[PDB]
Ligand binder design. Sequence first.
Ligand SMILES: COc1ccc2c(c1)O[C@@H](O)C(=O)N2O
Ligand SMILES: COc1ccc2c(c1)O[C@@H](O)C(=O)N2O
Ligand SMILES: COc1ccc2c(c1)O[C@@H](O)C(=O)N2O
Ligand SMILES: COc1ccc2c(c1)O[C@@H](O)C(=O)N2O
Lengths: 491, 491, 491, 491
Amino acid sequence: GPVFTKLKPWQIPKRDWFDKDFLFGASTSAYQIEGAWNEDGKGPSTWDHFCHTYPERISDMTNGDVAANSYHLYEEDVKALKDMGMKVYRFSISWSRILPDGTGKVNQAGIDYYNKLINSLIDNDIVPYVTIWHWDTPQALEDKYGGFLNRQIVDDYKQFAEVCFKNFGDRVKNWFTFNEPHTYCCFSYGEGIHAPGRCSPGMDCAVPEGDSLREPYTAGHHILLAHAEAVQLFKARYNMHGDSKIGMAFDVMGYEPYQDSFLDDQARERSIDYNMGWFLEPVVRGDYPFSMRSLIGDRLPMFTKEEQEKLASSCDIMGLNYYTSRFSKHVDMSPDFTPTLNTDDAYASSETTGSDGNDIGPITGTYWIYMYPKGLTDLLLIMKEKYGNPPVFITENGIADVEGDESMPDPLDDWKRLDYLQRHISAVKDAIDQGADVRGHFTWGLIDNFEWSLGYSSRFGLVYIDKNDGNKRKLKKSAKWFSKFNSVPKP
Amino acid sequence: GPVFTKLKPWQIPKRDWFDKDFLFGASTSAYQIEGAWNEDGKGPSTWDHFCHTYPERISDMTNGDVAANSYHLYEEDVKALKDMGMKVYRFSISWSRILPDGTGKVNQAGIDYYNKLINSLIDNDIVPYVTIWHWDTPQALEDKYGGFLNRQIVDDYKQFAEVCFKNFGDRVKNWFTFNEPHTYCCFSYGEGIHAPGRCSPGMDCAVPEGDSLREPYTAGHHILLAHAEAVQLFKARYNMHGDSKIGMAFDVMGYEPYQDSFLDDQARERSIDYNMGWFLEPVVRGDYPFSMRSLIGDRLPMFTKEEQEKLASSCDIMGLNYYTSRFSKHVDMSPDFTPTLNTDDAYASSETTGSDGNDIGPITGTYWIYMYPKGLTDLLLIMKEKYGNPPVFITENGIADVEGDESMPDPLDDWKRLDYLQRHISAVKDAIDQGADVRGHFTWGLIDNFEWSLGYSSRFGLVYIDKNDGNKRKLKKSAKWFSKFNSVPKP
Amino acid sequence: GPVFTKLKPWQIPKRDWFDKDFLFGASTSAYQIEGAWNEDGKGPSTWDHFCHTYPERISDMTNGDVAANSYHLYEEDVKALKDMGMKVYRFSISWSRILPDGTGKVNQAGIDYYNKLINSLIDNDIVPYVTIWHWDTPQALEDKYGGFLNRQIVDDYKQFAEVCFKNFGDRVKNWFTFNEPHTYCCFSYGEGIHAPGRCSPGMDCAVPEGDSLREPYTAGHHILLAHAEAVQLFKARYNMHGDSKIGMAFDVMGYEPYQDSFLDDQARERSIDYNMGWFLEPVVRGDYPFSMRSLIGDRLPMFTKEEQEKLASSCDIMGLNYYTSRFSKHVDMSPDFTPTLNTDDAYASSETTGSDGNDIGPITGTYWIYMYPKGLTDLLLIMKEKYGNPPVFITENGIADVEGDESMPDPLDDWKRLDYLQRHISAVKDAIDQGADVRGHFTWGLIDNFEWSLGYSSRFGLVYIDKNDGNKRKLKKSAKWFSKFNSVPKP
Amino acid sequence: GPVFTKLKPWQIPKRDWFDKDFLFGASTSAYQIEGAWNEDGKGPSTWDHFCHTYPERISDMTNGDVAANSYHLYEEDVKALKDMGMKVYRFSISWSRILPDGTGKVNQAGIDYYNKLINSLIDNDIVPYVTIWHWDTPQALEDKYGGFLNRQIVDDYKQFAEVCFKNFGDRVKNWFTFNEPHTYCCFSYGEGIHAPGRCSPGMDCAVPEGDSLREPYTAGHHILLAHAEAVQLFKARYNMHGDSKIGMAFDVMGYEPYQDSFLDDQARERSIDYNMGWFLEPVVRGDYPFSMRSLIGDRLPMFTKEEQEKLASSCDIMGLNYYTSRFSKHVDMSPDFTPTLNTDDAYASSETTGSDGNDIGPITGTYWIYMYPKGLTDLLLIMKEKYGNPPVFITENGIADVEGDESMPDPLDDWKRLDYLQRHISAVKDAIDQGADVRGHFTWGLIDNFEWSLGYSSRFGLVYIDKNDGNKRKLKKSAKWFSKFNSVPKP
Ligand SMILES: COc1ccc2c(c1)O[C@@H](O)C(=O)N2O
Ligand SMILES: COc1ccc2c(c1)O[C@@H](O)C(=O)N2O
Ligand SMILES: COc1ccc2c(c1)O[C@@H](O)C(=O)N2O
Ligand SMILES: COc1ccc2c(c1)O[C@@H](O)C(=O)N2O
C-alpha cells in the first residue's frame, strides 16, 4: 500500500553482468549540493535570484544557499563514492562561481575549488565526468540581456566552456555541455516553475511576462548553438591527445501508446521527438525533428547551413537521464484545440494511466516517478536502431523518498530505491544484450540534495544528508548494496 | 470512471473475419430462464429446493420460480435469436421437468415442451446445441442418496441422458453432457454458495455439514463417470448416422503469472490444471492432472483401468465458458499453510491485481468480471498445442450490467457489453489465425436471467427482459449490433 | 562397432572461440588420487572404512589405499597440468587428513601437504579451485553419530571449512563446499552402492539397515544446512578483500521427453527438479523444488525461516558436473506404483532409449555414459533463463575407457575421449553464444583414478597412470591435444 | 521388441483436421491384384513373363496369375472402399489386357472390365484416379524391340494412353501417366530384381546382359518422352471441358544428412535430386537435375529443345509415393570409387543408420520401411518452396506386415499400420499448416496384394485378403478406424 513487489533474489544484477569497461557511478549538480552561494567572490546565478526573489515558488520555502554544503564538505562526497566503490562521479561546474559576472575576470577561488575536487577524485581512483552547465546561468547575464533568450549567450557560454577546458582539461576527459535542455526549456520558459520562472501572461508563474509558445524554443535554439560552438572549439584546441570526449545529457521519458491503434503509435513518435528528439536530433543530423518543424513552424528557429553542419555529429557520448515513462495519447488538429503551452505542440498528451485504466507502473514516492524499466530499454534500442548506436551513458536514474510518506519512516531503509535501481540496471543489461552501446550507469543522487521547486522535501540520494546533524553523510541501504556489488574491501 | 476505452471502429470484427462454417449464437440454461418450476408435473430441482429453503442465500431474495418465463414465452426467445441472426441456440434440458422423480416415469408434458422449442428453432433455421445438465439435479435424488455425492447418480444420469437422446436425438445433433463442473463443485460443495449449499462445519453456507476438501472431488468424480457412461451409450446407440457430436462445457479463467519468476510460472500451470484440467484432462487422457493427484492425493478418487479408457477421448467438441482472467501467485508448501477449501489445493492464489499493483483489466460491472481478452486467446492456444487442438466452441462469453451501477442507467444502452464482446470475438479470430480449431462463439445471455446467488441483480443478456412489463423481450444495443453483423434483412 | 563418428576437422574448438578470461582446467578428488590413507596421522574416512570392511562392493576388489599416490607424487600432477597448458586445477581437501577425528586437533602434516600443492600450482601459474568435501567424511564422525544423518555434522563441517579458509584462504580464492550432493545421497543412502553403503532392509547393499525413502533426504538436508553455515561464515570473515568466491558443484544429467507429449514434458521437468533442483533451488531461493515437496512431503525436511534466508543466494559460482543425458518417461500416480527408492519420488523414469527405440546417444565406454552434448547446452540455458544466469563452471566433464573394451586396446590412444571433449567444449560455446554465463570447463580426470564402486576398471584421465610402472604419468592423445589447443610452447 | 510406441489418443488425426475438399483414398495396381492374367484375350505382360520364366526371382515362388482375383471380385474392392468411407480409389489399367499385342486390336473384354469398375465406383460415390502404366509393359513389345529401352515405346505408349482417354475419359478426370519411374528404372534395369530383370554382366539378376550404368537412364528417358507425348495429346484433345487433370506418381524417400557437415548437406541434395528430381525436375522445367547431368554425362540422354518445352509444366498434379527415409552420406570423387550401379551416380550412399549410430526410425515390418514421418513433411515443403507448390497427392503411403513376424500373429490386428498411417496423416496436416498444397492421402494397400519380388509374403492392405478362404476381403483394425474417421453410417 502502495503494493511494491521486489525482484526475486536471483534476478538482482551482479557487477559481472557487465564487462570490465562498464562504468558505475553517481551524479549531482552544483546548485543542488554546493551551498556557499556567495562565498569567495561567487556571483549569483539565476537560481540564487529566483529563490531569493520568489521564495514561495519552492514547495518547502528552501533554497540552495547551503544545500549539502559540498563547497566545504566535498571530501565527504568523495568518501561516499569510494565507500560504494563507484568508478565515476558526474558533477557540474558552477558558471557563476567561475565567472561571477558571467564574462570577464575568472574567480581563482572557484578554479581552486574544482581542482581540489578533481584531484581528490583522481587520488581516489574515481573518474570525473563534468557537466559544464546545469541550469546554472549567472544572473549577471540574465539581467544584462535575458540570458538564454539572447544570442549573446552563445559566445559567453563558449568562453565559459573554454575556461573549463583550459583549467581542467588536463585531467577531465569526459564532458557534457548541457543538462536536460528539454526539461529546462519546458519548466523555465513554458510552465515557468523553474528559474528564471517565465510563462505567458495570465499563467501562474513568478514572471508571467514571457511567451510559453516561443521562449522555450528560443532558449533551446541558443543552447544548441552554444553547444555547437563549444564542441567545435573543444575538438579544435582541447583534444590534441585524442582521448577526450564531449557530449550532452538529455532528459528522457519512455512512451507507450495510450491505446493500441495506429493513431497513438503516431502520437508516441511525436512524444519521443518532442521529449528526446528536440535536442538529440540536432546534435545528430543538424536539425530538429521534422514533426516539430511541421507543428511549430515559425516559432521554432531555423538553422543556417553552417550551423547545421557544426551541430551534426557534435556528440561523442550521449547522456540519458531516465526516471519514468508515460502513455502517449493522440490529439487531433482541429479548431477545438489551440496550443498555449509549448508541450501542446506535440499533439500527444502524456498520460500516467493507460487505455485499460491501469497506471503505467507503481508510484515510487514523488508524484511523477512511476516505475517502468521497460521504457528505458526501449529508448536505448531506439538510440541503437535509429540514431546510429552512439556511446550512451545513463547519466541519471533513481527515485525520490518524499517527506510525509508514511511508508518510508526510516530515511536509510531505502529498499524501494534499491529495488528500482536494480531493476533499471537489469534493464540496461537487457539493452546491452540486444546490441545497444551502453557504457555506464550513474545513479542520480550521490547524496540527497535540493530538488528545485520541491526543495529538500524530495530525497534522491544513495547517501543520506543529515540536515539536523551537520549535513553528515550516512550510507543508505542502497549505498551499502553498491559496496557489496562493487566488491569494496571491508574494514 | 471506471475508465472504459472502446475499440477503434476499424478494429470491430466483421462476420467475414470468420469462414462460412463458423457459428455465432447465444446461450441460456433451464433454471435460469424457464420458470414454471412446478407446472405440468415438473418435480423440484436442487435449485428450487435451495432457494425455497434458504431464500436469504440469494442476494436480492429472488428465485427461478418464474425467471423469464421461457416455459411459456420460448417463441419470443426464438424470435430474439432470429432478429439477431444467430445460427445457434445453446440451451439446457431440465432433468426435473423430464423425470420429476429423478428416475422412473417420464413427464410427457416436459418432452412436449422441448420438442416445441426444438422444432421452432429448426423452423427458424437455428441449430440447437443442448446441455443435458446445468446444475439442475432433481431434489428427489438429492433426498434419496445425496445426489452427486453418491455413485447411484451415475446410472440415473445415464438413463436421463438416454431419454434425451431417444426423444430429441433425431433433430438435436450436438450435445454437452455437463456445464461447468469446476464451478459447480467449487461453489456447491466447497464454498457452498450454490445448491445444495454445502461446506465444512464452521464455514458460512446454508448447510455446513459437508467437507470442502472432499465433497467437491467426490461430486466431480461422479460427474466424470456419469459423462463417460452417457457418451459410451451415445456413440454405441445414438450416432448411427455418424453426424452427431457430444462433449462437455468447461468454465475457464485465463491466468498470468503474478510476478515474472519461474515460481509463478509454475503456479500459473497449477491454476490452469485446477480450473480447466480438473475435468478436461480426464476426458482427454482418462485421468486428472498430475499436479492435482500429487497435491490432493487420497481426497481425489482413483479411476479404474476401464474407467480411464472410457473417459479418454470421450469428447467430440469442447465448450469453453470464458469471462475473465486472474494472476496466479505461488503459495509454498509449509506448516504455515493448511488447505481448508478445495481451491487451496492448487497452491496458487488467484489475484485480480498483479505484482506491479495494476488490476488485470477494467471491471465490466459485476465484481468478478475483469476484461482481459488476451486470456482467452492464450487458453485457446493451450487447447491447440497441448490437448490436440480438438473442436472448440466458446459456449459462454459476456458481461453483466449490475443493479445500482450509476454508469449504466439505461439497461438497453449496453455499449460496454458490446465492446467487450467485440474484443473477445476479435480474440477468437486471433486464435484461429494462429491455428486454433475454434468453431463458434455463443454469447452468454441470450436474455437477462437468474444469475444464481446474485438473483436478477446481474443482467447478462443481449436481450433485455422487462420484468415490470410482462417479461417483454427488448433488444439491447449489443443485440442490434449482431443484427447488423449477421446481415439480417431489415423490415 | 559401436559406430563412433568423429567431428569434422573444421568443427573442432579452438582456444580463441572463448575469451581471454575463460578458464580451461582438469579435476580430481582426494580419495580418488591421494593414497597415503593412513599416513602422517591421517584418520580413516567413510570410504577407507567402506572399502576395508566391504571390499567385495568394489567391482575389481580395489580401494584408495594408494590410488595414484598423489600424496607423494603431486608434483607430477602439477607437471601434467602445466604440460597441457591448463589454467585451473580443481581438487579436493581430505577432511580426515586435516582432522583425523573429524573434530579437534588439526593434523599439521595434512595442512603442510595442501600448502605444498597450492604453492606449486601458483608457482606454475595454475589457479586452484578447491572442493572442501568430496564424499570424504571422517569415519570418526560416522561412528560417533552417523555422519551426515545427524545434525551435528552441520557444525563439525563448519569448523572443518573454517580450518580450510584460515590456512588456505590467503591463496585459494575459489571454493566449492560440496561435490554432487544428489549423486551422494542417491548412491550412499538410496541404492547404498557408495559409502557408508546404506539402503532399506531387503535391498542389496552392504548395510541394509537404513531407509532408501528417508535417509537420502535427511543427509541432503544436513548438507544444505552445512553449506549455508559455511558460506555465512566465509562471507562474514574470509572475504575481507572481496575477491573470493564460494559455491557448490552439482551432478547433472540432461533430460529429453521420452515421447512427444505434454505428460513427458512434465516428467522431464520433474527429472530436472530431482536431479538438479534438489540442491540448486535451495541455494538459489532457499527451498526445495515445489515438485519434490508435493511428492515427498513429510520425508523431505522443512527449512525454518532463517535457514531459508541463509540458503537463498548462498552461491557465488555454480559448478556443473555433466557427463550424459536421459529420456524422462512419465509415471502415473496410482495404487499400482509405490516408491521404494528415493529416485522413485520423481515419478519420471530415466531411460537410455527413447520412444522411437533409439539410444539417446553413442555409448562411450562405461555403461552409463551415452554421448549427448545437446543436453549440456540445454541445462546451461535453463541456468540462464530460469535461475538468474549465475556464473557457471563445467566442473566435471569426460568419459571413461573401460577395462576389457576391445575397441580401446591402447590406453593412450583416447581419440574417443578427445572427440567427446571437443564436442562438449563446442556445446559450451553454443551456450555462451546464446547468452549463458559459462566461465570455464574442467575435464574430469586430470589423471586416471579410483572410480568408486568400479575401482580402477574405469579410466577417466586425460593423463594415464601406469599402475605397473610406478604410477608414472603419461599424456594420452587427448592431453596432447590440449597442449596444442592451449599453445603450450614446445621443447 | 522392436519397441513400438503409439501416438497418444489426442494426437490422432480427425477428418475435420482437413478441409471438405481434401481426399482420402486407397491404392492398388493391376498386376498386383487383378489375376486373370490370360483371361478373355489378355496378352502377357513383362511381369507375367518374368515370373513364369524366372519364378525363383520371387521370394516365395509366387506370381500374379490370380493375386486377389480383382478381375472377378472387383465389386468386393468397391465394397471395402465404401465400408471405409474412402472418397477416392487409385488403380491402374493393364496395358496387356487392353492391347494384348502392345499395339493394334483393342481387347473389348478389357475395356468392358474397367468400365464396370469405373461405373461401380461412381455408383458408390467414389472418384477414380487412374494410373495408366504401373510397370505393366506388354511382353509383345519387350520381345519386339526391348520395350522401354527402345524409342518405339514412346508412340506405342501414346496410342495406349489414347485408348484409355477415349474409352474412360468421359468419367475418369484424374490421371497418372507412370508410376514410380525411379523405382522401376533402378530395380528393373539397375539391380534387375524387377521385370524384365536386367543388369550388368557379372551381376546377380535373371538376365545379366544389360548395363546397370546405362539401361536405367535409357528407360527413364523414354518414359519421360512417352509422358510428354501423352500429356500433349491429352491437353489438346481430351480436356475440352477443362476439368481433367493428368500427372505422374513419383516414389520418394526423405533424406537427412548422415552427419552434421556441409558435405552431407550437399550429399542430401544429390540424393533428393536422384530419387525425386530425376523425373520430377524434367516435368517441371524440362530437363534433368544439374547434379545428375554433371555426374552421369553421356550416359544420361539429352533432350532436344522441343522435347524440353513439351516436358516443362507437363503435370497438373504430382503424386508422391512415400514410405520411408534415409540418411545421405557423402562419397568423394576419387580413383578409389568407380560407379557400377546407377545409384552410385549420386555419390551419396543411403544409410538406415545415422552418424550417432541410431536407426533413422523404428522398423515397421518389412526390412526397408523405417518409420520417419518427418521425412514426408520435409519433402512436401520442398515441393512448395522449390518446385512452385503444385497440387500434390500422397498417392501411396503405408507399411507391410510380413510373414514370419512373431510380433504380428493376427493379420487383422494391424495396430502398427494404423499408428504409422495416423502419424503420416498428421505429417501431411503439418505440411498443409505450413502452406504446402497437399490435396489428398491414398493409403497404399486397399487390399493385400502381390508385393513384386517378395510375393505375398508382404501384406500392405488396409483390407485383408484371406487367400485360404476364397480371397475373401476382411477389414483389418486400420480399415475399421477409417470407417470411424470418415463417419461411415453404421448398420
Ligand atoms: C515532472 O517534474 C520533473 C520531471 C523531470 C525532472 C524534474 C522534475 O526535476 C529533476 O528531478 C530532473 O532531473 N528531471 O529531469
Ligand atoms: C466468481 O463467481 C462466479 C464465477 C464463474 C461463474 C459464476 C460466478 O456464475 C455464472 O456467471 C457462471 O457461469 N460462471 O462460470
Ligand atoms: C550412474 O553411475 C554414476 C553416475 C554419476 C556419477 C558416478 C556414477 O560416479 C562418478 O563418475 C561421478 O562423478 N558421477 O556424477
Ligand atoms: C527397397 O525396396 C523397395 C523400395 C520401394 C518400393 C518397393 C520396394 O516396392 C513397392 O513397395 C513400392 O511401391 N516401392 O516404391
